[PDB]
Ligand binder design. Structure first.
Ligand SMILES: C[C@H](CCC(=O)O)[C@H]1CC[C@H]2[C@@H]3[C@H](O)C[C@@H]4C[C@H](O)CC[C@]4(C)[C@H]3C[C@H](O)[C@]12C
Ligand SMILES: C[C@H](CCC(=O)O)[C@H]1CC[C@H]2[C@@H]3[C@H](O)C[C@@H]4C[C@H](O)CC[C@]4(C)[C@H]3C[C@H](O)[C@]12C
Lengths: 185, 185
């Protein structure tokens, strides 16, 4: 029923379809509400980008909480579980993936948003006792590394969706491509 | 002036924007010509996909001919030159990249088209005396491996285009991600 969730869902769809340029008028209309109502929730496109990114990240991380087992010590096994979690989430919720990938490479996420993103799920930190995933790049390239992860993830989802009889095969082959590209031992 | 090239350019733009579903009416209109005229060049959407794919592949390969040096013996160095060639071509011709990537994962390329694609530029074969690039996957996954190459390439082009002061850095970091993902020694 509640208007914030309706606006966040409408913003998810609109950005998934149109990118960050998506219109607040269209988003407000697709929700129940007047555009003025939308502005009381997010006064700027910049704040909507930041709010929606944290919303989508929270949703993903909660799905990962449901799926992840902590008897796992092996970094590669833990990374595979994370990858499987992300692919499932984007196959279940294609617009949430499409939206988050455009928000992630928008140049509009604030340092406050990054810290709230890094903080929100302590349970998902570390899960490596020191880390393997994308720690080899300079800080300037962390967004680029995230973009490559998302590109490999999106291609894996596309083939698994089109050819579901081999979905697990695409997910495993995509994981090993991601692992080689974005880790070092 | 010539109508085939005008239609192939209009088909490139339309598929880049809309995918393989792009309308022959729109393509014909964006070219000089009546839709009936378009059908004398490609009687089906299937034949346009195949014809346009070979056209775009020929264009890419000719650009690679202009750029590539044959004193190169090292497989990694040769693969880097190929990658640099592809990224330059897609930054110079974004719609040609966007089109070819949708055609490549369309399920509509004919075996005849594949053989003509494999044959067209003997000069680009081998350039490895036995090969490293994507020879580790089963034949069923060659399209998937091509999709991962294209995804990594597209992300590299996006960041190089947005942040041209570091274009070479994104190209080098993207190459090493592609190389790790899609080769084995
Ligand atoms: C939750 C999990 C483990 C915790 C961590 O190491 O940060 C991490 C590792 C890689 C992360 C992902 C990658 O950084 C790529 C994406 C980046 C976006 O900014 C968030 C979604 C995105 C898909 C990330 C979600 C989540 O924070 C992931 C999946
Ligand atoms: C021309 C060059 C070397 C010759 C070869 O080994 O086939 C090859 C190696 C990898 C090839 C690319 C990859 O297979 C990924 C893409 C696949 C598409 O079907 C054609 C474009 C595409 C971008 C390919 C163009 C070209 O055939 C490439 C770049």
């Amino acid at each position: 029923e509640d208007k914030k969730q309706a606006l966040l869902e409408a913003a998810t769809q609109a950005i998934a379809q149109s990118g960050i340029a998506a219109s607040t008028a269209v988003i407000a209309r697709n929700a129940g509400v007047a555009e003025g109502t939308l502005f009381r929730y997010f006064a700027t496109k910049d704040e909507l980008i930041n709010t929606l990114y944290l919303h989508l990240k929270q949703d993903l991380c909660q799905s990962m909480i449901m799926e992840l087992d902590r008897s796992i010590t092996d970094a590669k096994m833990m990374t595979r579980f994370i990858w499987n979690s992300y692919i499932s989430w984007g196959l279940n919720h294609p617009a949430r993936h499409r939206a988050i990938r455009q928000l992630a490479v928008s140049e509009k996420l604030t340092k406050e948003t990054e810290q709230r993103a890094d903080d929100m799920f302590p349970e998902l930190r570390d899960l490596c006792h020191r880390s393997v995933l994308m720690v080899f790049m300079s800080d300037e390239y962390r967004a680029f590394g995230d973009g490559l992860f998302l590109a490999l993830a999106e291609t894996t989802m596309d083939f698994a969706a089109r050819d579901p009889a081999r979905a697990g095969e695409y997910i495993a082959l995509g994981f090993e491509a991601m692992w080689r590209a974005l880790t070092r031992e």
